[PDB]
Amino acid sequence: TTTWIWDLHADAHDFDSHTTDLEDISRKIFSAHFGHLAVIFLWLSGMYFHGARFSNFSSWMTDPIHIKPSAQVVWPIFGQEILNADMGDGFRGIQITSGLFQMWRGEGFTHEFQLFWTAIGALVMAALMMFAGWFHYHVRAPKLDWFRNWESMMNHHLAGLLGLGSLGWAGHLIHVALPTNKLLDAGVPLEDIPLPHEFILNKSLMVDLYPSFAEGVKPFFTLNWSAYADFLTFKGGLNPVTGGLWMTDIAHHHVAIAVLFIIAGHFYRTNWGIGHSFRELLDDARTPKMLPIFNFIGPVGHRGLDKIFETSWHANLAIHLVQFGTASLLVAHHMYAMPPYPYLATDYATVTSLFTHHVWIAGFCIVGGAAHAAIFLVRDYNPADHVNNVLDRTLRHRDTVVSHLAWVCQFLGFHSFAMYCHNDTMRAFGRPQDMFSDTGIQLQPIFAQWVQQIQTMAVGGVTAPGLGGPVSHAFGGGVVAIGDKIAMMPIQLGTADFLIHHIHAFTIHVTVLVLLKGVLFSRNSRLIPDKGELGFRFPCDGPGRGGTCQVSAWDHVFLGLFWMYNSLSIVIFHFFWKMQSDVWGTVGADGTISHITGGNFAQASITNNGWLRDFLWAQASQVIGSYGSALSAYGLFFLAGHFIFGFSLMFLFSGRGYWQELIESIVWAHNKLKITTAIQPRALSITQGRAVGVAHYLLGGIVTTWAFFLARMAAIG
């Protein structure tokens, strides 16, 4: 039947679904990770090759204020060469929003052969990854005690991967990227920029940019580190030429975290007696050894948990996908407010796209962390290992956890969203004094305003005397302007910011509620006492007990994907409106700031009608008025994303029993004309129809926001 075709592509990469031997499972995982590294190196080879061959990068490096970055040219077939837009400088292409040019300028790239030899090195190292995956599987695969050496793996990845990676990048910053960006910010044209090996061969050429280099590596070994305080600086603020962070703060950052990570890579005991072991740290976290505030975790505590990490790859994937969500969320929030690349903060199409991308990467990773947490509890969890420890006691009060979470989701939905419905009703009545607003009933976010005042008072310098400028200009300080364009200014928080932050707290808590109830009730419940015996992924247990549709832990990941999408859409909508309204814009010749949407977030974002009219209706005029221009691919992708959203609701709202009885009549008509095939035509399964419906829903909604974000910012940003 046709179900075998869909089941084969779904049974592809789960390895314990075959014969479960952990050493052979761990070897297929270790060599597939080499293959995914070869895919990343092949994709990195493309971005450096298209940056070296199909770009305006040498033209953009002359004057990065008035030149738009392009790195994709389009062939002249079917009339599709209209998308090759003028970027300035006579170059016709597609305006890229990834920010590769701002990344390459800060790293020290100056020509299009340096990007070429980086593309060759990524093409070489991709072939080295698909040899190491062949060698460490088909020739000399390791065995299970090598995979179980946590203390050696933690020591080698803290000190060796992160410590030597950022120390080695601090070598590239100090000897290549600090002189190249110091000459560029002091206005030196690119014929006169020395090639980056001449800052090492001609050592005297770095002496006049940094006089501490004449005194050599000798103050480092004698701990006279204050001699170096002109290329490793604790400045803060932004560069007034580029808008990026100070490159001497970036170098001293990657020096200080290098020492902190190499120190961290000596914490664990491997072969020499010195260090902590993972088992002794976990077997001691229990009563009576903990604090008396934590007496509730009981006498076993964390004692049975090391057998999880001995046996379960899914449980480690659950933690690591969560922390890649934590890292990518930090990358989103910290790179808009402390922009680390030159001429990044005033490229508004790039700041929009970089925040939105790394928010969405983080939200899929968090759902995957909850998905593979439920796979561990169904497949890998053995209850004999966990008697009265913190895993067993969590499963024994799951009714208190879910019902307390269900209450706080209802509290947050009333006391965030229903206050917008209060505000919609009060404004329609003509009672603006009765609204939750800065001019009505104020809800000042006083704890976030207090932190902003602390973050400003810290630099001067009550608690951090070492800075000159602020950590970020979003906290306080002043307006940074690059090319009469705002790079970063203080972001004022009012009643509109109190309300949208409690919307975020509401939509995250519900997304936790869908995912945590799926994990905590994955093995059994009061409804299905043998739910773990039915598997991780199954449609239901029949129409009985009232109806048991979507009880499986897979279907909670299915519902959690919609709620993650609903949560992160409001997050990027909060970002896109507030940056256009209160941050981005133009410093006039008068001295006054005229923002993009003119400061309308404080009064219009407090109702649903203002989000519909002033955000959704007003700002989508660029994407719907793009037909017959160079932004017309965004206008086509805008309607294409609307199509797949409506198309997804056929799979989500219907069931396969209709479609199987519809197929028998078309099977009948194919049999009357004698053209039957052997593989028998089946409707999709109940889980396949849910997986297709959620994939097309998320694809339809994200492509629509992507076309709306990028058509507006490529026109007016």
Binding site: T425, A428, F429, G430, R431, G546
Partner: protein, 222 residues
């Protein structure tokens, strides 16, 4: 068990909240009810049809009453192209003064809704001219609906309950509905059009006080 719903004993013994929702959605499915004989099915449908008829007549009686009480029908028939029909008045004590000023529209002195159903254009063509015309039309349908409520109660009484063979008489119904419901009513509507709606279209008031005097035609009925 509970007494509700009285038509389904298996829903009475339902101990969950499913009992209340399923009692709504099966309340008018008379054939699945407990002990519904096939002749008692037709008699309850017949009385339910009288109840639906009275709701329809009460609905149009309220449209006529609220135009006669709170509308602008006598002001709208002066110039129907420069005026706006009023549906009813607004009483919402949560209104602010900008909402009160915004809905004080179409020449009214209180907040009103603009009628968009077209009943002003329909009553004007068939000869309604005054709010006293719409009021007695609203009172007549207020009594016509109470006749429908009486006939539903009456044809459930044991002497007046019709038997099954009366309900299956598909020749006496199809004759009476073709000639009486479709024919005599279309004949009586022509009698309203030529006696009332055509003289009021030509400036002549014809009401119940002077319709036995005024002929529809100068060559009257000859």
């Amino acid at each position: 068990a509970t007494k509700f719903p009285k038509f389904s004993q298996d829903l009475q013994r339902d101990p969950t909240t499913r009992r209340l929702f399923y009692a709504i959605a099966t309340a008018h499915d008379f054939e699945s009810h407990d002990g519904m004989s096939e002749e008692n099915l037709y008699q309850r449908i017949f009385a339910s049809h009288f109840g639906h008829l009275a709701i329809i007549f009460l609905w149009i009686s309220g449209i006529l009453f609220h135009v006669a009480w709170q509308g602008n029908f006598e002001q709208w028939i002066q110039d129907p192209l420069n005026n706006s029909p009023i549906a009813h008045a607004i009483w919402d004590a949560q209104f602010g003064p900008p909402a009160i000023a915004a809905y004080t529209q179409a020449g009214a002195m209180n907040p009103v809704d603009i009628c968009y159903s077209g009943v002003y254009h329909w009553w004007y063509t068939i000869g309604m001219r005054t709010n006293n015309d719409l009021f007695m039309g609203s009172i007549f349908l207020l009594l016509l609906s109470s006749v429908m409520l009486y006939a539903g109660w009456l044809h459930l009484q044991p002497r007046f309950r019709p038997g099954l063979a009366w309900f299956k008489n598909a020749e006496s119904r199809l004759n009476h509905h073709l000639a009486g419901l479709f024919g005599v009513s279309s004949l009586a509507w022509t009698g309203h059009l030529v006696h009332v709606a055509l003289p009021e279209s030509r400036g002549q008031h014809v009401g119940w006080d002077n319709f036995l005097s005024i002929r529809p035609h100068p060559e009257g009925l000859a």
